[PDB]
Design a protein around this motif. Sequence first.
Motif, PDB file in Angstrom:
ATOM      1  N   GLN A   1      -1.492  12.453   1.419  1.00 18.23           N
ATOM      2  CA  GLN A   1      -2.484  11.679   0.682  1.00 18.23           C
ATOM      3  C   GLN A   1      -3.032  10.501   1.473  1.00 18.23           C
ATOM      4  N   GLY A   2      -4.007   9.814   0.877  1.00 24.05           N
ATOM      5  CA  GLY A   2      -4.613   8.642   1.489  1.00 24.05           C
ATOM      6  C   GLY A   2      -3.888   7.382   1.044  1.00 24.05           C
ATOM      7  N   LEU A   3      -4.513   6.233   1.252  1.00 24.04           N
ATOM      8  CA  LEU A   3      -3.882   4.958   0.947  1.00 24.04           C
ATOM      9  C   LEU A   3      -4.209   4.483  -0.467  1.00 24.04           C
ATOM     10  CD1 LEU A   3      -4.848   3.169   4.295  1.00 24.04           C
ATOM     11  CD2 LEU A   3      -2.696   4.384   3.783  1.00 24.04           C
TER      12      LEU A   3
ATOM     13  N   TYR B   1       4.013   0.774   2.433  1.00 30.23           N
ATOM     14  CA  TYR B   1       3.688  -0.095   3.546  1.00 30.23           C
ATOM     15  C   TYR B   1       3.519  -1.542   3.112  1.00 30.23           C
ATOM     16  CZ  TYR B   1       2.485   3.996   6.400  1.00 30.23           C
ATOM     17  OH  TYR B   1       2.506   5.174   7.113  1.00 30.23           O
TER      18      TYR B   1
ATOM     19  N   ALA C   1       1.494   3.406  11.012  1.00 32.81           N
ATOM     20  CA  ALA C   1       0.797   2.683   9.957  1.00 32.81           C
ATOM     21  C   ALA C   1      -0.682   2.554  10.339  1.00 32.81           C
ATOM     22  CB  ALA C   1       1.408   1.308   9.748  1.00 32.81           C
TER      23      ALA C   1
ATOM     24  N   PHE D   1      -9.411   2.709  -1.868  1.00 34.83           N
ATOM     25  CA  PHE D   1      -9.618   3.430  -0.612  1.00 34.83           C
ATOM     26  C   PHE D   1     -10.155   4.832  -0.884  1.00 34.83           C
ATOM     27  CE2 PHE D   1      -7.147   0.758   2.411  1.00 34.83           C
ATOM     28  CZ  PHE D   1      -6.182   0.163   1.624  1.00 34.83           C
ATOM     29  N   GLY D   2     -10.884   5.391   0.076  1.00 34.80           N
ATOM     30  CA  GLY D   2     -11.306   6.785  -0.021  1.00 34.80           C
ATOM     31  C   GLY D   2     -10.168   7.711   0.422  1.00 34.80           C
ATOM     32  N   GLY D   3     -10.388   9.025   0.352  1.00 32.62           N
ATOM     33  CA  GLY D   3      -9.350   9.992   0.725  1.00 32.62           C
ATOM     34  C   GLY D   3      -8.935   9.909   2.195  1.00 32.62           C
TER      35      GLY D   3
ATOM     36  N   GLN E   1       6.153  -0.706   9.484  1.00 33.49           N
ATOM     37  CA  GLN E   1       6.280   0.716   9.793  1.00 33.49           C
ATOM     38  C   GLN E   1       6.184   1.629   8.568  1.00 33.49           C
TER      39      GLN E   1
ATOM     40  N   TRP F   1      -3.829   1.039  -3.015  1.00 38.22           N
ATOM     41  CA  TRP F   1      -3.417  -0.354  -3.140  1.00 38.22           C
ATOM     42  C   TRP F   1      -2.497  -0.495  -4.347  1.00 38.22           C
ATOM     43  CZ3 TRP F   1      -4.898  -4.331  -6.789  1.00 38.22           C
ATOM     44  CH2 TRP F   1      -4.479  -5.577  -6.442  1.00 38.22           C
TER      45      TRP F   1
ATOM     46  N   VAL G   1       0.828  -1.200   0.000  1.00 41.44           N
ATOM     47  CA  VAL G   1       0.000   0.000   0.000  1.00 41.44           C
ATOM     48  C   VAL G   1       0.866   1.256   0.000  1.00 41.44           C
ATOM     49  CG1 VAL G   1      -1.790   1.252   1.277  1.00 41.44           C
ATOM     50  CG2 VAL G   1      -1.815  -1.247   1.197  1.00 41.44           C
TER      51      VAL G   1
ATOM     52  N   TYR H   1     -10.107   5.414   7.260  1.00 44.85           N
ATOM     53  CA  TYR H   1     -10.254   5.118   5.842  1.00 44.85           C
ATOM     54  C   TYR H   1     -11.324   4.074   5.565  1.00 44.85           C
ATOM     55  CZ  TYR H   1      -5.844   7.519   5.324  1.00 44.85           C
ATOM     56  OH  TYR H   1      -4.844   8.457   5.335  1.00 44.85           O
TER      57      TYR H   1
ATOM     58  N   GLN I   1       1.419   5.434   0.321  1.00 47.79           N
ATOM     59  CA  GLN I   1       0.847   6.665   0.844  1.00 47.79           C
ATOM     60  C   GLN I   1       1.778   7.858   0.673  1.00 47.79           C
ATOM     61  OE1 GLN I   1      -0.074   6.644   5.023  1.00 47.79           O
ATOM     62  NE2 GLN I   1      -1.763   8.084   4.663  1.00 47.79           N
TER      63      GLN I   1
END
Lengths: 123, 525, 37, 28, 50, 49, 49, 99
Positions: A42-44, A94, H40, H92-94, A118, A46, A36, H82, A38
């Motif tokens: 920003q968000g996650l 990640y 994380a 995933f969303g923001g 981590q 895949w 994943v 999330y 990031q």
Amino acid sequence: VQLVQSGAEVKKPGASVKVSCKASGYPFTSYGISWVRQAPGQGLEWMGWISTYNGNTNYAQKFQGRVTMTTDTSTTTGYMELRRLRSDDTAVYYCARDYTRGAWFGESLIGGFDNWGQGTLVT
Amino acid sequence: AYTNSFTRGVYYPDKVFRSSVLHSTQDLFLPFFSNVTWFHNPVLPFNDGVYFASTEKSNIIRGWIFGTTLDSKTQSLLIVNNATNVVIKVCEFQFCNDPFLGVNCTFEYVSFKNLREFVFKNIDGYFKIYSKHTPINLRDLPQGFSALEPLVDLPIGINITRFQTLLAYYVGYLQPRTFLLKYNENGTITDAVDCALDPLSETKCTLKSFTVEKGIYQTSNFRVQPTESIVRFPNITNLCPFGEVFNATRFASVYAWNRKRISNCVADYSVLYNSASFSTFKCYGVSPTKLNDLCFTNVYADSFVIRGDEVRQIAPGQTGKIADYNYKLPDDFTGCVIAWNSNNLDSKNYNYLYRKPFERDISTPLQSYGFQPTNGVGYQPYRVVVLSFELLHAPATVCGPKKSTNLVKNKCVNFNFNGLTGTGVLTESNKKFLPFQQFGRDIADTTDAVRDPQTLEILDITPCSFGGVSVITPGTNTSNQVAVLYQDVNCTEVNVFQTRAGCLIGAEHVNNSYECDIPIGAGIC
Amino acid sequence: FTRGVYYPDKVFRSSVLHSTQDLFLPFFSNVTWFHAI
Amino acid sequence: LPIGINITRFQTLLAYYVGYLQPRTFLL
Amino acid sequence: VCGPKKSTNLVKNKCVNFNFNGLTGTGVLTESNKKFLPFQQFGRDIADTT
Amino acid sequence: SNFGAISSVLNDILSRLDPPEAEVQIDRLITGRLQSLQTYVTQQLIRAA
Amino acid sequence: SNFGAISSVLNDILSRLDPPEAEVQIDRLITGRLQSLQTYVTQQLIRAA
Amino acid sequence: IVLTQSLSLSPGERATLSCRASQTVSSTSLAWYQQKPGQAPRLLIYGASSRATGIRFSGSGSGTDFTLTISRLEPEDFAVYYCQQHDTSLTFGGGTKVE
Ligand SMILES: *[C@@H]1O[C@H](CO[C@@H]2O[C@@H](C)[C@@H](O)[C@@H](O)[C@@H]2O)[C@@H](O[C@@H]2O[C@H](CO)[C@@H](O[C@@H]3O[C@H](CO[C@H]4O[C@H](CO)[C@@H](O)[C@H](O)[C@@H]4O)[C@@H](O)[C@H](O[C@H]4O[C@H](CO)[C@@H](O)[C@H](O)[C@@H]4O)[C@@H]3O)[C@H](O)[C@H]2NC(C)=O)[C@H](O)[C@H]1NC(C)=O
Ligand SMILES: *[C@@H]1O[C@H](CO)[C@@H](O)[C@H](O)[C@H]1NC(C)=O
Ligand SMILES: *[C@@H]1O[C@H](CO)[C@@H](O)[C@H](O)[C@H]1NC(C)=O
Ligand SMILES: *[C@@H]1O[C@H](CO)[C@@H](O)[C@H](O)[C@H]1NC(C)=O
Ligand SMILES: *[C@@H]1O[C@H](CO)[C@@H](O)[C@H](O)[C@H]1NC(C)=O
Ligand SMILES: *[C@@H]1O[C@H](CO)[C@@H](O)[C@H](O)[C@H]1NC(C)=O
Ligand SMILES: *[C@@H]1O[C@H](CO)[C@@H](O)[C@H](O)[C@H]1NC(C)=O
Ligand SMILES: *[C@@H]1O[C@H](CO)[C@@H](O)[C@H](O)[C@H]1NC(C)=O
Ligand SMILES: *[C@@H]1O[C@H](CO)[C@@H](O)[C@H](O)[C@H]1NC(C)=O
Ligand SMILES: *[C@@H]1O[C@H](CO)[C@@H](O)[C@H](O)[C@H]1NC(C)=O
Ligand SMILES: *[C@@H]1O[C@H](CO)[C@@H](O)[C@H](O)[C@H]1NC(C)=O
């Protein structure tokens, strides 16, 4: 259960990075490895999922042709190789244990990414 | 300090009159010539019952405490004779660190020169007390014989694991051994034989007579016991994906069930069995708790969604819309059927269609199940997984989470080879097994030889040596000395003489020939 | 002729006459011959 | 093979001989 | 805490259906010459027969 | 022989089932095997005569 | 004789019960009839002596 | 498929977080995560409503509209949450920040 990854690295555009992940506290074969991304602020996202049992790997369209994932069950590790890096790829990568897809059958499961490492920062 | 219990510790096993008869009975008695501890306030174990005896000069011993914790945590039994009044209580007592006497309750009752013998046992919640009082003139217990009679029977329902004596005395323990009891004309026990003491006592019990005639008699069967335990499974390190069957996002419809093959794995069935999320867990050819000791050649998981009322059709010997047209099991089916309610997973939902054993006919006739979250239980969807088990007949591949051990050759062991169990001696064979053969069989249908699951070697299984045991008795009218013949066994397996008939122990060999008296066999008397 | 036999199961046996029953080709049966020319 | 599939006919893909099996007793 | 199981009168020298505590059977009750011990309630013949 | 039991092998019954059912399967083998010994002994006694 | 079976006639059991239940009723007749033959044979062998 | 997420609340207050999908979801393939700053993400909810081991947190919903609620906020709940959908590929969303 604990996942641990490598430390941060800095790369110039066009360079490649190999991001390692090691894990313990569970039988390796039954769970896959999810990567994943990031980026800061920003968000996650895949990136992909690899079976530790048969090598089958699924990838998000955004990284297809750029990332290769592999596993080594004798050391309880997995690796993600990112080729032809861009400045656009500055992010924390990640490694998470993945139970949303079957390690043996490749089918969707009712679950999530429970134990995360981590995060490895790559510039 | 320890002493010889001799022949004491016998009591009348019941309240039945018997006269001029030798009666064989098995009960908790002190073994003859047992090792009893000699005391001059320790806490001792109770085990299966206690033999207690005391010798007195001035009434030093006053009573006993029986129970578990004996520390105001639960009920305990207190029996004390204070001066003149015997008091029995079963209250949740707080006892002292070292209780002694000077110079919530469910039951209450109030009433060397001498020997007072007691038997304390607790069977099915009833505490039984037997005793005998007799004068003595005696460092040890006196040698002699008598039987103790029942006096008290307390319906207390209390577990006793430990006891203590409240103030010489002796403590022994009772064992479930067989005795031949000699009853006289007046209904008392005047003598006894401990049937597990020695070969002569065995002869006396076998023939039901205190006096035995000259001759050779068979009393028992001798067998070499295993000294180790061997657990043999292939060292597979792959955890078996049952979660991928039971935790799946999508299940198939019953007309087109999904058959998943499970192989090359360690099958932990404790999760499936112990989990409370299942509405049912029913096995037909196996027990649900034995699944971790067994190993299968294959496991097949048939995954599908059905309506609640039809869950009962997923079984052998059934008929109905599913049993006949969608998913049929064998009548001799071996496996486990596990199912759970999926009303909060699948219901909304008309995407589940329905109409020989394990035939999957998906030719298209089909109807849908109207699964809605607000319907009754019989109309709610259930997720069904049938785990079909292929039992050992060929090398097994799917084994439970057993820890393997090393294999010991040329000794009697308790073995387990992929679920195949028994007792015997493992030795190298000269057999040639085919690639698909894990074991062979004898004419008796017993295992002849096996393939080790970790090492590709074939071992023969030889049953542990055994044979009849006969006692050679000159006749107890002349002598209590006996010799014992172990039939058809080696003297290295059991003043020893090895002959064709077996191993003869205790008889002296003589080169001079004599006319035969008590025969052994094969020219030997 | 005498062809048609196979190992009825996967259990090792030796020095024995064993009676079994299964889907075997009957001895001296009539089988169709398909040539390849 | 764990097929769950009905077989009533078959075809050979390219000499060969075809017979049929029967539930008969044999002494082996 | 158990109820008062009721008793009846005992009749001697006749064939009766008897019930003594927990032991039942059919037979004729007569005076014995058997010296039972103070704690013995029932007796037996050689082949475990009352 | 099975004698109505799920298995001719006593250890297989004990390894597969718990006592509530294992005892039933065993009792079937006991009746059959005890009957076999009784038949054998009767034939040995007649032949011995 | 019934020997505990619903019917002494084998054909009447088979025409009434499906195998999962018929087999039980049949086993009752088999035990009785097999036992009867064993009794008959033992008597014939002793008489033959 | 695309997820859109949509918090200023004091400790002790009830929090509601939500996400919308451009397409319907199987529901059982919905999961929620919590990411504390400098750490994380961890799994909180899976299977739409089931609680992950070691986790006041509850999930629910259907179709294209799902929520995550906290019965009472703690100082340790001030993290970014999330919404994850994984029935058809993974997205995933923001993410929603809670203060
Ligand atoms: C289907 O999936 C179910 C969920 O799986 C979990 O969540 C997914 C998203 C992934 O993260 C996955 O990796 C997770 O496991 C799964 O249910 C789970 O089953 C395991 C057993 O294998 C349970 O573990 C045991 O938990 C108990 C404690 O439970 C209590 O506390 C928790 C706190 O969260 C509560 O939620 C519970 O309701 C209870 O109140 C432990 O005591 C136990 O330890 C003991 O037993 C183990 C052996 O199992 C020994 O080694 C130890 O020494 C102890 O003796 C376990 O840790 C897990 O709690 C349970 N989770 C949930 C949410 O129910 C289900 O089993 C899967 N189905 C199949 C067929 O695999
Ligand atoms: C009891 O066992 C001990 C060994 O632990 C032995 O020394 C002692 O002589 C034995 N006593 C009797 C009476 O057998
Ligand atoms: C013995 O102790 C009981 C109390 O447990 C007491 O009531 C009784 O009077 C005592 N008897 C004598 C003789 O001291
Ligand atoms: C008696 O037992 C009850 C529980 O049934 C307990 O609450 C009470 O405290 C106990 N009393 C004493 C004196 O131990
Ligand atoms: C005795 O121990 C058993 C467990 O072996 C337990 O079930 C029972 O309740 C206990 N009884 C008492 C009186 O403590
Ligand atoms: C039986 O008791 C009487 C006394 O009533 C006694 O004389 C006789 O010797 C006793 N017999 C036996 C065998 O103990
Ligand atoms: C057991 O471990 C050995 C290595 O020590 C390996 O060669 C062998 O193949 C393993 N067996 C199985 C069944 O995995
Ligand atoms: C297989 O197909 C035949 C028709 O060719 C049919 O008669 C038979 O019942 C089918 N078998 C199964 C198990 O469906
Ligand atoms: C054998 O028994 C008789 C009594 O019947 C006895 O007189 C004789 O002394 C006994 N023999 C020996 C050697 O004691
Ligand atoms: C008994 O054991 C000895 C020592 O191993 C051996 O020499 C002898 O042949 C064995 N006899 C039999 C009958 O097995
Ligand atoms: C019998 O005689 C032989 C010599 O031929 C000798 O070796 C053996 O020890 C003798 N046995 C006894 C019991 O005297």
